[model samples]
Target: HGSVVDPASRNYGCWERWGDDFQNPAMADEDPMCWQAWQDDPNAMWNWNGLYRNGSAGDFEAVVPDGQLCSGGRTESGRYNSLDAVGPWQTTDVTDDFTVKLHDQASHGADYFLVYVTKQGFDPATQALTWGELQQVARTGSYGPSQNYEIPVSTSGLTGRHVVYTIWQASHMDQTYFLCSDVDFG
Candidate 1:
């Protein structure tokens, strides 16, 4: 099995649920944003588990510049570079407060896990995500190798649809992974 720790790596779960069906004509009508990603590069969607930048332990700001957080700041062969594609993808309805369970099957322990929520009134349908659109909500302390993390998040002023961005800074190495999960607030 491959490492699922990287937020940018999509193969473990979300990809099967969303990426696998990217080509269905129905999905084109239903989730055009994902469809666009597929159109851009099917390989990028298939190899979603590959977006990572090594040797970026600390100073996430210096390594991952603005507008490329979801893409892991890399334009490699995989379409992970296309993850920042703007538009409606998929979303799970959530409460004002929620929990995110991150499991690192490979035991790649992380130094910290920082989670952010898109700013209120920010629509994922029209524009690409920029640093100005996010607000950090939770950050974890240093942890050991191959661990499961339960991150609790609390936020306000978020209504309708939004994206949950996660940054996993691996403690085992100087690596950082970026991931984006869609959610709808009730």
Candidate 2:
């Protein structure tokens, strides 16, 4: 349920750093994205326990809209609206090809995982992520009852800084989890 780069994700760095300091004004200049999230809804950053979809089996395009992909397009009470905040975020470097590992604590009915990479010309540093800036990179076929899932991805033509967007759709309770992982392709 945590993310590696998404500052709006429940496991974002600011969550651990600021803790109960949701009203800290310094965050506005330091971590604006997170600060805005705290202002909108602190629960979005602290409540990582539930990241699921409302209904069963649906297509990505049908479920998550264009700009709201990062926050799973949620505007409700526990919405992760801050995830869509455009700003500086943490990142990690990797090769042209890399593996993404997922840990399902409850081993809920696993379904599938769809992965996408930002387009070559896409600059995450300059703008917020949109659907048009992504390209399908990899997808998992079948999911199992196992507690963990690892999938390999190929970023062949992609280089520089990019965001690895993943959609983990679980067969259990029709839950779909969306997360963005920042990466520097070398």
Candidate 3:
């Protein structure tokens, strides 16, 4: 009766298969278990393992590696499709300097490599999703003692997850890291 757009009241997001309406051929349709993820089951969350996660660079044109998902990413102004996290990420507060290493490539336009430290205050008593600030640190190049940014702990305490929003954009028609990671420093 319902489509990929389920009636899960617990969350406010929906699974939309753009260019495809389940019966279409382009985007085809939503995942059969798409609705299950939205269920109240904690295990059904997008992630439940490590601190790392997956995301995309909005409306970009490039081939991604296997195992990665399409986040249906978009820009802040343009409608062009980009990429975002299509999987679950570990909840942790990384108040230290870390390196965001990855293996990818970009061309034509400049891809934004960003790392976000949010302020989601996860309470031990109530466990409510309150509010907090978000800091976005961008990746411009690959060197410099004065280049690395310092994230403030006071502004990034929300959710108490100490989340890191990292990115690897395509800057040229070239191949990027086949293996990458972030080096955190406190």
Candidate 4:
């Protein structure tokens, strides 16, 4: 139903960058992470906003295990599993304070949003992501149904490359969206 637009999520960013020319061989060199992603499954990008699971019921850790958080525990039939690859995926520049902007194409609302940033020493580019490596930065209450939503997050003692993992609990049902965003502090 939606995706984190700014600091774009893995497949969303891949789709945004190469959806028009996804088959180009040049991507293999320019953006290997995305290249592998496209090579693995083009549908991941085609339906970037559909990376969600139903019946989660708030047991995120049990449903989504470490090293697989990027794909919502291989949600959507492993369409986004490529996102869990540990490599130098591209990153968005961010300051100590930034916004986690989500685009809800279906005009959906959120029961809550949990935003977490990787620890300062954790290197997302070289190592796999795990729940223990994350530091919760923002937690929201609720939002009414809207086409777009923004959750302002502030952090300190963070630098270089890190992953911004966002969990969107949709109000429509027990649907939950897990998104991974790569970012660099600048």
Candidate 5:
């Protein structure tokens, strides 16, 4: 079980922001995206770190697909389907150069990590995410069994709201974690 902690992945952010007050009615006002996720299935947020899909065998695109990349192709019996919804998800502000950090409680380690940013003109808020819209920013090599992994990424000429799509390949097995993080490049 793991998730990108910094620039928190969709479900991770939802859990972080409202896991304690999920029953509150204020969610619809303060965080509509998370609100809808809770309404769809609370498990989506409760099990934030359990976003990985097993036996991917590096066929990420075939399994993840487009539009539903945020949900790992509606992984976990659609527990994360809400993550694919197009809306104004809360974002973490970032600069041109930043680090994406992940917390791997299972410490499965990593075969690699592929970090990508949405094209400059693609609006995640109003558009469904597609594979073609993403441009790879960093491709990391292998890492040892550890509780944490930090990947430095650099990009240029990109601004405004975008989604950071991360692909984490676990070394122990053919398991892959597909995470989407909303960010505002300011």
Candidate 6:
């Protein structure tokens, strides 16, 4: 639920500043303070480390607990990082109209989240992720998770079990570097 921060190293450059909407049109105008980076730690769901772009978190104290702050770069000891609960939790009927809105923010590698829903799983090794052999599928372009594409799921065929969603950093043969932070479901 929290963005990655390398405990040993500190990020100095201002991706948030240079990437401002008014500063540069090429850069994604997402807040560099924090954005969903990765999904590995499952305990940081309610951390205040961030402010939802649309919802109401109330006040500043409503942020992440003390010491657990959202840094600009990855922690020296951490690997992957990202914001939590970007989507709502569903208990019963699962809606189908899913969309991934990528906001560009400063960071590293190529950032892109993969959208897939299968009765089984989306494993490159075992499952054939080919477009013709897949179930409801969608993908994001090599843009910052903060901006660029609002990819929609195109699940016209295929079916399995468990649903799979992955946010990837570093794509386009390592030609781009950025961070992703949001998702909208309909």
- TM-scores, in order shown? 0.83, 0.79, 0.31, 0.98, 0.98, 0.30
Q: What are the per-residue Cα lDDT tens digits for candidate 6 across 1-186? A: 222221100111122223233234333324322222212332222331231221112222232222222221222233323322222211112234434333334343334544544333433223322233223365555554332445565543333222233333344232221122221222
Instruction: Report the lDDT tens digits of candidate 5 across residue range 1-186.
Output: 699999899999999989989988888998999999999999998899988899888888888878899999988899899999999999999999989999999788999999999999999889999999999999999989999999999899989899999999999988899999999998
User: What clash count does candidate 4 reach?
Assistant: 0
Q: What is the TM-score of candidate 6?
A: 0.30
Model 2 agreement with the true structure over 123-144: per-residue lDDT tens digits: 8767778888999998788786
As for candidate 4, its clashing pairs are none
lDDT score at residue 175, model 1, on the 0-100 scale:
74
User: Against the true structure, what is every candidate's RMSD?
Assistant: 3.1, 3.3, 14.6, 0.7, 0.8, 16.2
In candidate 6, where is summed lDDT lowest over 10 consecutive residues? 4-13
Model 1 per-residue lDDT at 110: 75
Clash pairs detected, candidate 5: none
Check candidate 2 and list the clashing pairs. none
* Model 4, span 86-130: residue lDDT tens: 999999999999999999988779999999999999998789999
**Considering summed lDDT, which 10 consecutive residues are worst modelled in model 3?**
1-10
Candidate 1 lDDT, 57-101, residue by residue in tens: 466677666777677675454456566666666677778888765
Q: Which stretches of candidate 2 lie over 4 Å from their true place?
A: 1-32, 75-78
Best candidate (score: lDDT):
4
> Between candidates 1 and 5, which one is better according to lDDT?
5
Which ranges of candidate 1 are over 4 A from the true structure?
1-14, 18-22
lDDT of each: 0.68, 0.69, 0.26, 0.94, 0.93, 0.30
